[PDB]
Design a protein around this ligand. Structure first.
Ligand code: TTX
Lengths: 477, 467
């Protein structure tokens, strides 16, 4: 049957040239004798170019192939929420199979312009430096940039953690990450009960390249099942860089014409799709949304690089992280100076705007004289006020990994420094101030904390009532 | 006609017809079978080669996933025809002219080929009118020639879009003619936004009384490459109607025309040609050129196109944006470092021209100052690398004056936007010619040497810079 079966011509480097199979469709799954799954892309004149999804060491020139007839479908449901999933949606954790009732496609068109609405719904991440100057709202695409070891994954680890139950569903997609390292994470997510609402769509380095592509695509489809259901999602794709690389590898193995850094001619339709399929659907579809936070590693702080260039131009903001501003105390390292957010403060409440907006104007003025501090032989107080109130807020902006702060905890804290309380204090000390003060308010004053959130804003009372709090509390240092 | 798909290699179709039928080049074909159980026909391509051997190749405008070999293709018999006319205003269009705004079908009078031979040499004109925008950097250091084409250049995130919005606000909502905005390779948000924003100002149809003065065609990022290579041409075919059929004066807002080249980049090597400078196609100059000389003003009317162009890795030597420039009567080159300073709109007062900076077309006061402004803006720029290491202690009392004034210029050259009221945090301000002209003449005269720098930063008029 040269119609729904075929012979294998050649298997070279995870790609196979199938012969026959006239009926195949572009994008259809084919099944090998030794049972190896692969997709079809080159519907060339008399042979089919198929990209394997596994160790092709198995395919043998002469073996036949069946045409699954299915255009790469993936199972989906609720049955996940706590299962480190593979790439063709099959468990890799050893807890049994997954009860899939429906099954959505990996690649599907993204929500258009009628099916969408601006972003107003906030997205709390537990990072004082993010949810106050880098406002990420639901449905909005926010990029995470940084070299090797730049606390980026950490920005992500805390964020998914920082999601109050029933609030936001999360998908953790690892592309080309290490097994171990994925595990060190998939654990630090359980020990805090956060793995009861997050999937771990991950494909290690060893895993064949024809997968690190779909790593996100799956990870995105699995999430789109909650969106169209009025639910909200957050997608973290650990490195789109390692996915772009896996792309290049397939085009060259399919013998397709390359270009800049050997990158194919459809390298921009790898992000302008993952990141588009994410959005805030109209209320005439479910108000459901999906916020994607894609990571893109850099080389030598070289932003203008192709992949990082392209992705930045697809996302609604970036959270640059620096390799020079680590040990300098800044932990986590947020270059809030270049880190932007196209949605605007629109992704924040009023209680945050009142403080954050103001904190914006501050950590924006210091930036202009910062380089002076070290060489300040005789500056004016009108500047000192800035090189004073400067490195103060920063230490508030510093955060210990694994500890995401609530929104209350977020606003109250900014309030201390932003309002001149932590002013005349010593930087190499302020860290413990907040740590101490926070727990102090959570214990003795959790009555005010619940006043803050519900009211969603600081009343003229709680202010004075905060004033009495901090002033006397700093007085306990 | 009827041929069969012969090879499907991504968004490229190699169709094989009978030795007689030969879809002429650029003639759009249309394919019969596609997505998951159900028969659509969205798969429309555009012949681009006669490989020979009874076989044209073609780029699809829709996704080929699911297509098959042998599927009957069909030669419509002419090029891809978008429906144009009055019945396109207030609607969001596909690269194929299909309504994408869920408001019923489009009741147009006649279609029209996105493939039209630009105006002849005797259908052109030389009139050079101004185009007051309302920003203290354009109308003063590089004005807008009506009919002419504006090139709003910059790198990834510099305020180009915010720049195309303020223009629709300052000029389009108040423009006394029809306008069209093309969506060439950009985010969807920006679309959703620019829509629900143009709705509130009622630039669109609040009621179907149809008093709209805008026609929208959106092919965003996600679309395959054979979509952003031509939505720039739908938007324009719909604009090349109001220009000559209703003798109207139309505006052509293309939010990034680069995504139009990038999109062609991607069908180049794919179709089997030999790449060129920086991975681009050999046919880069033939592609964005044939579609910037239809976007012009003629005697029959006019097209004031205010087009944006992406600048990869911050480099202007880059073949993609570089090419544009020729096709421009003005340029607003934005900076990433001058944007890293907070001064917005981040526009480099030095690298930004306009053919109409002629005293023969605006005046002497507009002519000198602009330069006087720039002159000092050349001085300080050639003083930086010097003072940065050589300090000021030995600088003459006649050169330290360049410094203060300049820092008063590069700042008085800031101006929040009515659309960017969320990035600046302060109310926008409309600063026309005279208000700007004189405002600066009060600076070049050291009439304001006392006042500080941040006195002109994010300020409306000179007075607002003295309050
Ligand atoms: C991964 C599969 C399920 C989806 C693909 N579809 C696409 O990515 C694009 C957006 N579409 C819809 C196309 O029609 C073009 N297809 C491909 O380029 C591709 C490219 C591809 C490259 C390398 C390995 C596999 C595939 N297709 C696979 C389509 O079938």
């Amino acid at each position: 049957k040269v119609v729904n079966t075929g012979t294998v011509l050649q298997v070279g480097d995870g790609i196979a040239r199938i012969h026959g199979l006239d009926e195949v469709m572009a994008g259809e799954l084919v099944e090998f004798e030794e049972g190896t799954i692969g997709i079809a892309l080159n519907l060339e004149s008399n042979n089919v170019g198929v990209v394997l999804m596994g160790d092709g060491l198995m395919i043998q020139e002469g073996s036949s192939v069946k045409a699954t007839g299915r255009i790469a479908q993936i199972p989906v449901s609720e049955a996940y929420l706590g299962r480190v999933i593979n790439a063709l949606a099959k468990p890799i954790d050893g807890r049994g199979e997954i009860t899939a009732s429906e099954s959505r496609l990996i690649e599907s068109p993204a929500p258009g312009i009628m099916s969408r609405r601006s972003v107003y719904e906030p997205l709390q991440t537990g990072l004082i430096a993010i949810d106050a100057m880098i406002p990420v709202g639901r449905g909005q695409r926010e990029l995470i940039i940084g070299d090797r070891q730049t606390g980026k994954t950490a920005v992500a680890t805390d964020t998914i953690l920082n999601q109050q139950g029933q609030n936001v569903i999360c998908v953790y997609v690892a592309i080309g990450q290490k097994a171990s390292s994925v595990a060190q994470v998939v654990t630090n997510f359980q020990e805090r009960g956060a793995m009861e609402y997050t999937i771990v769509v991950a494909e290690t380095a060893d895993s064949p390249a024809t997968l690190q592509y779909l790593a996100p695509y799956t990870g995105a489809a699995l999430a789109e099942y909650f969106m169209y259901r009025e639910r909200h999602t957050l997608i973290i794709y650990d490195d789109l860089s390692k996915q772009a690389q896996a792309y290049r590898q397939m085009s060259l193995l399919l013998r397709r014409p390359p270009g800049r850094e050997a990158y194919p001619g459809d390298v921009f339709y790898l992000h302008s799709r993952l990141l588009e399929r994410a959005a805030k659907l109209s209320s005439l579809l479910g108000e459901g949304s999906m916020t994607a936070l894609p990571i893109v590693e850099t080389q030598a702080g070289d932003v203008s690089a192709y992949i990082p260039t392209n992705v930045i131009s697809i996302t609604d903001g970036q959270i640059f992280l620096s390799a020079d501003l680590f040990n300098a105390g800044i932990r986590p390292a947020i270059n809030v100076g270049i880190s932007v957010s196209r949605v605007g403060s629109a992704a924040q409440i009023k209680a945050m705007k009142k403080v954050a907006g103001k904190l914006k104007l501050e950590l924006a003025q210091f930036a202009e004289l910062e380089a002076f501090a070290q060489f300040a032989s005789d500056l004016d107080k009108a500047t000192q006020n800035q090189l004073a109130r400067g490195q103060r807020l920063r230490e508030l902006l510093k955060q210990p990994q694994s500890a995401p702060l609530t929104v209350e905890e977020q606003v109250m804290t900014i309030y201390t420094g932003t309002n001149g309380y932590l002013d005349s204090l010593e930087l190499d000390q302020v860290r413990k101030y907040l740590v101490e003060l926070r727990t102090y308010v959570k214990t003795n004053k959790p009555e005010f904390q619940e006043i803050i959130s519900s009211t969603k804003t600081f009343t003229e009372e709680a202010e004075a009532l905060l004033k009495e709090a901090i002033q006397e509390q700093m007085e306990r240092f | 006609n009827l041929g069969r798909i012969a090879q499907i290699i991504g968004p490229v179709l190699n169709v094989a017809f009978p030795p007689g039928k030969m879809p002429n080049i650029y003639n759009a074909l249309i394919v019969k079978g596609r997505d998951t159980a159900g028969q659509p026909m969205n798969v429309t391509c555009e012949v681009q080669q006669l490989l020979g051997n009874n076989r044209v190749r073609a780029v699809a405008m829709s996704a080929t996933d699911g297509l098959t070999r042998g599927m009957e293709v069909i030669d419509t018999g002419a090029p891809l025809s978008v429906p144009v006319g009055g019945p396109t205003l207030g609607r969001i269009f596909n690269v194929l002219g299909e309504p994408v705004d869920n408001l019923r079908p489009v009741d147009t009078r006649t279609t029209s080929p996105i493939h039209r031979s630009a105006p002849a040499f005797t259908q052109l004109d030389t009139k050079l009118s101004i185009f007051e925008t309302g920003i203290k950097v354009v109308n003063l250091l590089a004005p807008y020639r009506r009919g002419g084409k504006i090139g709003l250049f910059g790198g990834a995130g510099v305020g180009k879009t915010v720049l195309i919005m303020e223009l629709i606000n300052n000029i389009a909502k108040a423009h006394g003619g029809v306008s069209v905005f093309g969506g060439v390779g950009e985010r969807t948000r920006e679309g959703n936004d620019l829509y629900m924003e143009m709705k509130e100002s009622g630039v669109i149809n609040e009621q179907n009384i149809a008093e709209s003065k805008v026609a929208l065609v959106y092919g965003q990022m996600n679309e395959p490459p054979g979509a952003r290579m031509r939505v720039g041409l739908t938007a324009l075919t719909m604009a090349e109607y109001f220009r000559d059929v209703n003798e109207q004066d139309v505006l052509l807002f293309i939010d990034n025309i680069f995504r139009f080249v990038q999109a062609g980049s991607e069908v180049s090597a794919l179709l089997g040609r030999m790449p060129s400078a920086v991975g681009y196609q050999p046919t880069l100059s033939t592609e964005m050129g044939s579609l910037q000389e239809r976007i012009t003003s003629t005697k029959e009317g006019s097209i004031t196109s205010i087009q944006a162009v992406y600048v990869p890795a911050d480099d202007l030597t880059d073949p993609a944006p570089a090419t544009t420039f020729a096709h421009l009567d003005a340029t607003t080159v934005l900076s990433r470092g001058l944007a890293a300073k907070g001064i917005y709109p981040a526009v480099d007062p030095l690298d930004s021209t306009s053919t109409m900076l002629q005293p023969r077309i605006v005046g002497e006061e507009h002519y000198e100052i602009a330069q006087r402004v720039k002159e000092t803006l050349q001085r300080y720029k050639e003083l930086q690398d010097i003072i940065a290491i050589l300090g000021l202690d030995e600088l003459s009392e006649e050169d330290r004056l360049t410094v203060a004034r300049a820092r008063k210029i590069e700042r008085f050259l800031s101006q929040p936007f009515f659309v960017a009221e969320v990035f600046t945090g302060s109310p926008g301000k409309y600063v026309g010619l005279a208000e700007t002209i004189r405002g600066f003449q009060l600076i070049l005269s050291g009439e304001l040497d006392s006042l500080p720098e941040q006195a002109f930063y994010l300020v409306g008029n000179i007075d607002e810079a003295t309050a």
